[PDB]
Each structure stands twice: as structure tokens, then as C-alpha cells.
Design a protein around this ligand. Structure first.
Ligand code: 08H
Length: 127
């Protein structure tokens, strides 16, 4: 069995910014989710080999995880907040696509996503 390469977290020719919204996404949104008791399955790419999920990357073609997001934020990979918001949403959606309602991992994603939504509700106006 084989995992795909992870999502990129470095691309020197991609234009980059550090906006106040991006800073909030790191200091508030990412930090809040990362410390949560349910963060651990989301803190790195899905290891389909170790988890014995050989169909995961047959079904999930746009993988995303908070490890990747954390690196992207810390390494100023993004141009805007929407890019990062999309990554979080891709992570949650993938979980729901792959798994079944009421599965433990879905309950975990839902708890994290509730917090995500509460924090992005107060994304600051771009300064
Ligand atoms: C994210 C994600 N999306 N689907 C899966 N995951 C996981 C990723 C990493 C780990 Cl260690 C477990 C799971 C688990 C998992 C299952 C029950 C409780 C905790 C994690 N399920 C497969």
C-alpha cells in the first residue's frame, strides 16, 4: 500500500502575504482547533497505510489536514484568508465524504467545525 505525496506547504514562486485576517487564522482559528481533545486525527495527513484504509485516496482526491494548514500559515504560504478557509472546509468535507454519519471521526470533525465556524464568524475586517 502507498500514500500520496502530501499537499504542498512550500512554493517559493507563489506570491505571499501576511494579512491581519491570516494572522487571526493562525493565532485564533488554528490554535483553537489544534489544542482541542479531538484534534489528533486531523494534525497530519491521513496515513492510509497505517490506518488500513486502502480506498481513502481513491475517494479523497483533495486531501487536507491541520498539519498542512499549520505549515502553510507558519510559512506564509497564502495570499488571502479565503485560501486558508477553503483548506479547513476541504478537511471537514473530506471527513464527511469518506466516513458515515455518527462515526466517531465525524463527531470529532463536527465538534472542530462548530468551533471553526464560531471563530471565522468574527474574522476581522481586512486592515
Ligand atoms: C481525519 C480522518 N478522516 N477519516 C479518518 N481519519 C483519521 C485520521 C487519522 C487517524 Cl489516526 C484516525 C482517523 C480515523 C478515526 C476513527 C475513529 C476515531 C478517531 C479517528 N478515521 C479515518
Amino acid at each position: 500500500s502507498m500514500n500520496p505525496p502530501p499537499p504542498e506547504t512550500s512554493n517559493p514562486n507563489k506570491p505571499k502575504r501576511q494579512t491581519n485576517q491570516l494572522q487571526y487564522l493562525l493565532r485564533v482559528v488554528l490554535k483553537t482547533l489544534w489544542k482541542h481533545q479531538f484534534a489528533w486525527p486531523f494534525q497530519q495527513p491521513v496515513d492510509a497505510v497505517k490506518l488500513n484504509l486502502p480506498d481513502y485516496y481513491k475517494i479523497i482526491k483533495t486531501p487536507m489536514d491541520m498539519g498542512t494548514i499549520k505549515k502553510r500559515l507558519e510559512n506564509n504560504y497564502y495570499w488571502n484568508a479565503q485560501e486558508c478557509i477553503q483548506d479547513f472546509n476541504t478537511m471537514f468535507t473530506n471527513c464527511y465524504i469518506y466516513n458515515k454519519p455518527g462515526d466517531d471521526i465525524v463527531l470529532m470533525a463536527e465538534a472542530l467545525e462548530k468551533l471553526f465556524l464560531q471563530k471565522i464568524n468574527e474574522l476581522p475586517t481586512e486592515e
